[PDB]
Short mmCIF file of C-alpha atoms and ligand atoms in Angstrom, two decimals:
data_model
loop_
_atom_site.label_atom_id
_atom_site.label_comp_id
_atom_site.label_asym_id
_atom_site.label_seq_id
_atom_site.Cartn_x
_atom_site.Cartn_y
_atom_site.Cartn_z
CA UNK K 253 96.36 82.18 115.14
CA UNK K 254 97.46 84.63 112.32
CA UNK K 255 96.03 87.99 112.97
CA UNK K 256 98.57 90.42 111.48
CA UNK K 257 101.44 90.49 109.16
CA UNK K 258 104.11 89.80 111.56
CA UNK K 259 102.24 86.52 112.39
CA UNK K 260 102.92 85.48 108.98
CA UNK K 261 106.37 86.03 109.27
CA UNK K 262 107.06 84.30 112.11
CA UNK K 263 104.69 81.18 110.73
CA UNK K 264 106.84 81.28 107.99
CA UNK K 265 110.31 81.04 109.71
CA UNK K 266 108.69 77.78 111.49
CA UNK K 267 107.63 76.02 107.99
CA UNK K 268 110.29 76.90 105.52
CA UNK K 269 113.61 75.87 105.38
CA UNK K 270 116.21 78.09 106.81
CA UNK K 271 117.97 78.71 103.73
CA UNK K 272 114.92 79.94 101.88
CA UNK K 273 113.71 82.09 104.78
CA UNK K 274 116.88 83.56 104.67
CA UNK K 275 116.77 84.34 101.13
CA UNK K 276 113.54 86.04 101.44
CA UNK K 277 114.27 87.74 104.84
CA UNK K 278 117.69 89.19 104.08
CA UNK K 279 118.62 92.60 103.42
CA UNK K 280 122.33 93.68 102.12
CA UNK K 281 125.70 93.96 104.43
CA UNK K 282 124.57 95.07 107.93
CA UNK K 283 120.87 95.39 107.31
CA UNK K 284 120.78 99.30 108.16
CA UNK K 285 118.40 99.83 105.70
CA UNK K 286 116.38 96.84 106.39
CA UNK K 287 115.86 98.02 109.88
CA UNK K 288 115.02 101.33 109.04
CA UNK K 289 112.57 100.79 106.38
CA UNK K 290 110.29 99.78 109.15
CA UNK K 291 111.64 102.07 111.71
CA UNK K 292 111.34 105.26 109.78
CA UNK K 293 107.49 104.21 109.35
CA UNK K 294 107.12 104.58 113.11
CA UNK K 295 109.06 108.09 113.44
CA UNK K 296 105.79 109.56 111.16
CA UNK K 297 103.01 110.22 113.40
CA UNK K 298 99.60 110.16 112.90
CA UNK K 299 97.27 113.57 113.65
CA UNK K 300 93.72 112.36 113.25
CA UNK K 301 90.90 114.42 112.52
CA UNK K 302 87.56 113.60 114.60
CA UNK K 303 83.92 114.02 113.75
CA UNK K 304 83.92 113.40 109.91
CA UNK K 305 81.57 110.74 109.60
CA UNK K 306 83.26 107.61 108.50
CA UNK K 307 79.97 105.30 108.34
CA UNK K 308 80.95 104.64 104.35
CA UNK K 309 84.94 104.08 103.97
CA UNK K 310 85.90 103.98 100.36
CA UNK K 311 89.46 102.34 99.77
CA UNK K 312 89.45 102.46 96.11
CA UNK K 313 91.83 104.26 93.96
CA UNK K 314 93.54 104.02 90.69
CA UNK K 315 97.04 103.02 89.31
CA UNK K 316 98.39 104.46 86.16
CA UNK K 317 94.65 104.72 84.80
CA UNK K 318 93.09 101.35 86.02
CA UNK K 319 91.09 101.11 89.21
CA UNK K 320 92.16 99.24 92.01
CA UNK K 321 90.16 98.31 95.14
CA UNK K 322 92.97 99.74 97.46
CA UNK K 323 96.01 101.48 97.03
CA UNK K 324 97.97 98.42 98.32
CA UNK K 325 99.68 96.05 95.53
CA UNK K 326 101.84 93.11 95.19
CA UNK K 327 105.51 93.76 94.44
CA UNK K 328 107.89 91.82 92.23
CA UNK K 329 109.42 89.19 94.30
CA UNK K 330 111.33 86.22 92.68
CA UNK K 331 110.94 82.53 92.96
CA UNK K 332 107.71 82.31 94.47
CA UNK K 333 107.23 78.64 93.88
CA UNK K 334 110.26 78.19 96.78
CA UNK K 335 107.68 79.30 99.27
CA UNK K 336 104.60 77.36 97.80
CA UNK K 337 103.90 75.10 94.88
CA UNK K 338 101.76 77.21 93.20
CA UNK K 339 104.11 80.24 93.34
CA UNK K 340 103.03 83.05 91.55
CA UNK K 341 99.56 81.33 90.15
CA UNK K 342 98.64 81.40 93.71
CA UNK K 343 99.48 85.20 94.11
CA UNK K 344 97.87 86.21 90.81
CA UNK K 345 94.86 84.24 91.88
CA UNK K 346 94.46 86.18 95.30
CA UNK K 347 95.04 89.68 93.44
CA UNK K 348 92.21 88.93 91.33
CA UNK K 349 89.90 88.26 94.37
CA UNK K 350 90.77 91.19 96.07
CA UNK K 351 90.67 93.41 93.43
CA UNK K 352 94.34 94.49 93.19
CA UNK K 353 97.42 94.61 91.16
CA UNK K 354 99.94 92.21 90.66
CA UNK K 355 103.88 93.28 89.67
CA UNK K 356 105.38 89.86 87.99
CA UNK K 357 109.14 89.32 88.74
CA UNK K 358 111.60 89.15 85.67
CA UNK K 359 112.58 86.15 87.77
CA UNK K 360 109.75 84.44 88.32
CA UNK K 361 109.56 80.75 88.86
CA UNK K 362 106.12 81.09 86.30
CA UNK K 363 105.90 82.31 82.71
CA UNK K 364 104.21 85.44 81.86
CA UNK K 365 101.75 83.43 79.61
CA UNK K 366 101.09 81.21 82.64
CA UNK K 367 100.20 83.84 85.25
CA UNK K 368 98.10 85.69 82.65
CA UNK K 369 96.14 82.45 82.25
CA UNK K 370 95.65 82.04 85.96
CA UNK K 371 94.60 85.50 86.71
CA UNK K 372 93.04 86.64 83.36
CA UNK K 373 90.99 89.27 85.04
CA UNK K 374 93.42 90.35 87.32
CA UNK K 375 95.24 93.56 86.87
CA UNK K 376 99.07 92.88 85.87
CA UNK K 377 102.23 94.62 85.38
CA UNK K 378 105.71 93.38 84.26
CA UNK K 379 109.01 94.12 86.18
CA UNK K 380 111.87 94.19 83.80
CA UNK K 381 115.49 93.97 83.99
CA UNK K 382 117.46 95.40 80.83
CA UNK K 383 119.56 91.88 80.10
CA UNK K 384 122.70 92.17 77.97
CA UNK K 385 120.76 90.31 75.42
CA UNK K 386 118.39 93.01 74.39
CA UNK K 387 116.62 90.39 72.24
CA UNK K 388 115.45 88.66 75.71
CA UNK K 389 114.60 91.77 76.94
CA UNK K 390 112.45 93.10 73.70
CA UNK K 391 110.49 89.59 73.95
CA UNK K 392 109.53 89.84 77.75
CA UNK K 393 108.11 93.40 76.87
CA UNK K 394 106.34 92.13 73.59
CA UNK K 395 104.98 88.99 75.67
CA UNK K 396 103.85 91.50 78.55
CA UNK K 397 101.96 93.41 75.76
CA UNK K 398 100.37 90.60 74.15
CA UNK K 399 99.16 88.74 77.38
CA UNK K 400 97.49 92.01 78.72
CA UNK K 401 100.01 93.19 81.24
CA UNK K 402 98.97 96.99 81.38
CA UNK K 403 102.63 98.58 82.18
CA UNK K 404 106.74 97.88 82.83
CA UNK K 405 108.48 98.53 85.82
CA UNK K 406 111.56 98.68 84.84
CA UNK K 407 114.20 98.01 87.58
CA UNK K 408 117.16 100.53 87.96
CA UNK K 409 119.07 99.80 91.03
CA UNK K 410 120.49 96.49 90.26
CA UNK K 411 123.71 97.06 87.85
CA UNK K 412 124.69 94.36 90.04
CA UNK K 413 123.35 92.20 92.94
CA UNK K 414 123.73 93.59 96.77
CA UNK K 415 125.68 91.39 98.81
CA UNK K 416 123.19 89.73 101.04
CA UNK K 417 125.63 87.92 103.74
CA UNK K 418 123.10 84.74 104.51
CA UNK K 419 122.89 83.80 100.71
CA UNK K 420 126.87 83.97 100.41
CA UNK K 421 127.08 81.80 103.70
CA UNK K 422 124.06 79.37 102.52
CA UNK K 423 125.29 79.55 98.89
CA UNK K 424 121.92 80.14 97.61
CA UNK K 425 120.41 78.30 94.36
CA UNK K 426 117.12 77.16 93.36
CA UNK K 427 115.93 73.67 94.86
CA UNK K 428 116.29 71.22 91.88
CA UNK K 429 112.87 71.32 90.43
CA UNK K 430 112.47 75.07 89.80
CA UNK K 431 113.38 77.45 87.02
CA UNK K 432 112.92 80.71 85.89
CA UNK K 433 110.58 80.25 83.43
CA UNK K 434 110.57 83.10 80.90
CA UNK K 435 114.17 82.45 79.30
CA UNK K 436 129.31 82.63 96.76
CA UNK K 437 125.50 83.46 96.45
CA UNK K 438 124.57 81.84 92.94
CA UNK K 439 122.10 84.51 92.41
CA UNK K 440 124.83 87.16 92.39
CA UNK K 441 126.87 85.50 89.82
CA UNK K 442 123.52 84.81 87.93
CA UNK K 443 123.15 88.66 87.82
CA UNK K 444 126.76 89.33 86.74
CA UNK K 445 126.38 87.10 83.93
CA UNK K 446 122.97 88.09 82.71
CA UNK K 447 121.93 91.80 83.68
CA UNK K 448 123.80 94.40 82.10
CA UNK K 449 125.77 97.09 84.21
CA UNK K 450 126.22 99.33 81.60
CA UNK K 451 122.97 100.36 81.61
CA UNK K 452 122.14 103.98 81.63
CA UNK K 453 119.55 106.71 80.54
CA UNK K 454 120.08 106.17 76.94
CA UNK K 455 118.57 102.30 77.56
CA UNK K 456 115.73 104.05 79.12
CA UNK K 457 115.15 106.01 75.71
CA UNK K 458 115.30 102.66 74.14
CA UNK K 459 112.74 101.23 76.22
CA UNK K 460 110.13 104.08 75.92
CA UNK K 461 110.55 103.77 72.38
CA UNK K 462 109.82 100.21 72.55
CA UNK K 463 106.55 100.03 73.86
CA UNK K 464 103.93 102.37 74.34
CA UNK K 465 103.02 100.70 77.58
CA UNK K 466 103.17 103.03 80.75
CA UNK K 467 106.85 102.59 82.26
CA UNK K 468 107.50 103.03 85.80
CA UNK K 469 111.32 103.78 86.96
CA UNK K 470 111.60 101.30 90.22
CA UNK K 471 114.21 102.04 92.46
CA UNK K 472 114.93 105.73 92.50
CA UNK K 473 115.84 107.33 95.70
CA UNK K 474 117.02 111.00 94.52
CA UNK K 475 114.71 113.91 93.31
CA UNK K 476 117.22 114.65 90.26
CA UNK K 477 117.00 111.08 89.14
CA UNK K 478 113.01 111.08 89.40
CA UNK K 479 113.30 114.39 87.11
CA UNK K 480 115.26 113.13 84.95
CA UNK K 481 112.56 109.71 84.82
CA UNK K 482 109.91 112.35 83.81
CA UNK K 483 112.07 114.15 81.11
CA UNK K 484 112.52 110.58 79.41
CA UNK K 485 108.95 110.43 79.10
CA UNK K 486 108.46 107.55 81.95
CA UNK K 487 104.79 107.20 83.70
CA UNK K 488 105.50 107.07 87.17
CA UNK K 489 108.41 106.36 89.83
CA UNK K 490 108.23 103.46 92.35
CA UNK K 491 110.59 104.95 95.46
CA UNK K 492 112.07 102.14 96.48
CA UNK K 493 115.42 100.44 97.89
CA UNK K 494 114.96 96.93 96.75
CA UNK K 495 113.50 95.72 99.98
CA UNK K 496 116.73 97.06 101.37
CA UNK K 497 118.74 94.39 99.19
CA UNK K 498 121.20 96.54 97.11
CA UNK K 499 122.93 99.33 98.71
CA UNK K 500 122.88 99.33 102.41
CA UNK K 501 122.59 102.25 104.38
CA UNK K 502 120.13 104.27 101.78
CA UNK K 503 117.29 105.96 103.62
CA UNK K 504 114.44 104.45 104.70
CA UNK K 505 111.49 104.67 101.44
CA UNK K 506 109.08 106.65 103.75
CA UNK K 507 111.64 109.20 104.43
CA UNK K 508 112.79 109.77 100.80
CA UNK K 509 109.30 109.96 99.40
CA UNK K 510 108.47 113.87 100.23
CA UNK K 511 111.60 114.75 98.51
CA UNK K 512 110.54 112.70 95.33
CA UNK K 513 106.86 113.69 95.49
CA UNK K 514 108.22 117.37 95.33
CA UNK K 515 110.57 117.03 92.62
CA UNK K 516 108.35 115.55 90.08
CA UNK K 517 105.61 118.28 90.41
CA UNK K 518 102.77 116.28 89.93
CA UNK K 519 103.74 115.24 86.31
CA UNK K 520 103.49 111.49 86.97
CA UNK K 521 102.36 109.28 89.64
CA UNK K 522 104.79 108.28 92.79
CA UNK K 523 104.76 104.74 94.56
CA UNK K 524 106.50 103.25 97.64
CA UNK K 525 107.79 99.99 98.53
CA UNK K 526 109.95 99.02 101.61
CA UNK K 527 108.61 98.15 104.88
CA UNK K 528 104.78 98.26 104.52
CA UNK K 529 103.56 96.06 107.18
CA UNK K 530 100.40 97.67 108.91
CA UNK K 531 97.36 99.67 107.47
CA UNK K 532 98.88 102.97 109.32
CA UNK K 533 102.05 102.48 107.16
CA UNK K 534 99.87 102.97 103.94
CA UNK K 535 97.91 105.69 105.45
CA UNK K 536 101.17 107.62 106.08
CA UNK K 537 102.56 106.82 102.57
CA UNK K 538 99.25 108.34 100.89
CA UNK K 539 99.72 111.45 103.65
CA UNK K 540 103.20 112.39 101.87
CA UNK K 541 101.80 111.91 98.35
CA UNK K 542 102.21 108.34 97.27
CA UNK K 543 99.42 106.77 94.99
CA UNK K 544 99.71 103.87 96.25
CA UNK K 545 102.19 101.09 97.93
CA UNK K 546 103.64 97.66 97.17
CA UNK K 547 104.15 94.83 99.64
CA UNK K 548 107.00 92.69 99.10
CA UNK K 549 108.06 90.09 101.91
CA UNK K 550 104.60 89.88 103.38
CA UNK K 551 103.03 88.29 100.03
CA UNK K 552 105.83 85.66 100.41
CA UNK K 553 104.96 84.92 103.68
CA UNK K 554 101.24 84.62 102.86
CA UNK K 555 102.14 81.94 100.31
CA UNK K 556 104.39 80.22 102.76
CA UNK K 557 101.37 79.56 105.06
CA UNK K 558 98.51 78.56 102.70
CA UNK K 559 99.57 79.41 99.03
CA UNK K 560 96.49 81.32 97.33
CA UNK K 561 94.53 81.63 100.25
CA UNK K 562 97.34 82.71 102.61
CA UNK K 563 98.52 85.61 100.21
CA UNK K 564 94.40 86.47 100.25
CA UNK K 565 94.39 86.37 103.92
CA UNK K 566 97.69 88.98 103.97
CA UNK K 567 95.84 91.27 101.44
CA UNK K 568 92.73 91.55 103.63
CA UNK K 569 94.59 91.71 106.75
CA UNK K 570 96.37 94.96 105.45
CA UNK K 571 92.82 96.05 103.47
CA UNK K 572 91.26 95.93 106.83
CA UNK K 573 94.08 97.61 108.79
CA UNK K 574 93.99 100.14 106.20
CA UNK K 575 90.22 100.87 106.31
CA UNK K 576 90.05 101.22 110.14
CA UNK K 577 93.34 103.63 110.26
CA UNK K 578 91.19 105.78 107.27
CA UNK K 579 88.01 105.78 109.51
CA UNK K 580 89.82 106.47 112.61
CA UNK K 581 91.82 109.55 111.30
CA UNK K 582 88.80 110.49 109.55
CA UNK K 583 89.13 109.94 105.98
CA UNK K 584 86.33 108.73 104.29
CA UNK K 585 87.93 107.92 100.77
CA UNK K 586 91.32 108.19 99.45
CA UNK K 587 90.82 111.53 97.86
CA UNK K 588 90.80 113.44 101.22
CA UNK K 589 94.10 111.94 102.82
CA UNK K 590 96.10 115.22 103.14
CA UNK K 591 99.64 115.92 104.23
CA UNK K 592 98.15 117.42 107.58
CA UNK K 593 97.77 113.74 108.91
CA UNK K 594 101.52 113.34 109.46
CA UNK K 595 104.40 115.03 110.97
CA UNK K 596 108.13 113.85 111.32
C1 LIG D 643 112.76 87.84 98.20
C2 LIG D 643 112.84 89.13 97.45
C3 LIG D 643 112.97 88.86 95.93
C4 LIG D 643 112.82 90.12 95.27
N1 LIG D 643 113.12 90.00 93.88
C5 LIG D 643 112.68 91.01 93.08
C6 LIG D 643 112.72 90.79 91.79
O1 LIG D 643 112.64 89.92 91.30
N2 LIG D 643 112.50 92.06 91.36
C7 LIG D 643 112.56 93.65 91.65
O2 LIG D 643 112.46 94.18 90.73
N3 LIG D 643 112.71 93.73 93.03
C8 LIG D 643 112.42 92.44 93.54
N4 LIG D 643 112.74 92.49 95.18
C9 LIG D 643 112.45 93.64 95.43
C10 LIG D 643 110.62 94.02 95.71
O3 LIG D 643 109.84 94.42 94.36
C11 LIG D 643 110.25 95.02 96.72
O4 LIG D 643 111.13 96.53 96.37
C12 LIG D 643 110.72 94.80 98.19
O5 LIG D 643 110.08 93.44 98.41
C13 LIG D 643 109.89 95.81 99.00
O6 LIG D 643 110.07 95.65 100.21
P1 LIG D 643 109.17 94.98 101.56
O7 LIG D 643 109.72 93.33 101.25
O8 LIG D 643 109.76 95.50 102.38
O9 LIG D 643 107.98 95.03 100.97
C14 LIG D 643 112.39 91.44 95.86
C15 LIG D 643 112.62 91.38 97.24
C16 LIG D 643 112.59 90.24 98.09
C17 LIG D 643 112.45 90.36 99.66
O1 LIG D 644 115.67 86.30 82.41
C1 LIG D 644 116.67 85.14 81.89
C2 LIG D 644 116.60 84.02 82.81
C3 LIG D 644 115.09 83.81 83.61
C4 LIG D 644 115.85 82.82 82.35
N1 LIG D 644 117.62 85.29 80.79
C5 LIG D 644 117.77 86.35 79.77
C6 LIG D 644 118.76 87.15 79.89
N2 LIG D 644 120.10 86.23 79.56
C7 LIG D 644 121.27 86.65 78.94
C8 LIG D 644 122.19 85.83 78.80
C9 LIG D 644 123.58 86.05 78.62
C10 LIG D 644 123.93 87.25 79.03
F1 LIG D 644 125.41 87.36 78.82
C11 LIG D 644 123.58 88.31 79.51
C12 LIG D 644 121.85 87.80 79.82
C13 LIG D 644 119.98 84.75 79.88
C14 LIG D 644 119.17 84.58 81.11
#
């Protein structure tokens, strides 16, 4: 049956209700950037070195000072219990098994504490939105601190929700037995009521003063903004177009990655998400200077297949594809994955 990430998507389409599959699949508007996040990887070609001794390939690396087994981590995707009963608890358990990290959504169907209890040994980070209610927002930061999360990924590309046409057509809402546990399209309306469209760099200053945890700006697409994040004392940039769900017609993340790596001059780690489906995608992102990549939808398809086991399967497929891509390219470890491996 399922031997690559595309197979898990096809399986998920067959078992999920249409409205749920569409919620997870969709991009914004005409979905131009959704297609490009994948197509763009194909335009970057690989230039493998031969004869380098790849008997011992070491995939390990570090994200913000914490060791991981592979440069492939789980991105925040809301409302995982729609895909499988165990939702975020299945995901964190898989991450713990694999030795990689999980970025927990602010809009999770499981609490900060519940996820820490299911994956006490797992590397865990909190994705944060700046809510109009700053008391709410501070409580989430404080809970992440108390519960052993290692960083805050502040999402900065969602002052309002993007217009995902299928969610408007299906009038998307949660199924009746689920809730966001830490507190037209129903989600777009939720955002307009709860999420602060006024936030600015001044609010980044506030968040930087609020916690000593490492803070990564998630959703940056311009070099000037990346430089501003560094000036505000943030500790990394997650180059992201929100899975192509916010502004349609922005570039693919792999295409804007080099500008952002150049702009930050090595001062902070740069990460990528958007369109990662294959081990060669991971290799390309690392050659262009990303420390690690995050996967969004593939994790949800793993949950839809088989909960914890299906997430573990998806992560193991990515890990093995990445190992093979490294070996065929002549790379024994991540430290020798250099820029001459790729050209556009
Ligand atoms: C179904 C879905 C839910 C998402 N929920 C969140 C969220 O709660 N918070 C957030 O910052 N980003 C959210 N994102 C964006 C992801 O964190 C990530 O940027 C994106 O999924 C990466 O692209 P990929 O799905 O192609 O791997 C979501 C994406 C999807 C597809
Ligand atoms: O994260 C959540 C939900 C998952 C539970 N909340 C925090 C922000 N709250 C907020 C209230 C009023 C308001 F006008 C703006 C923001 C309510 C929603």
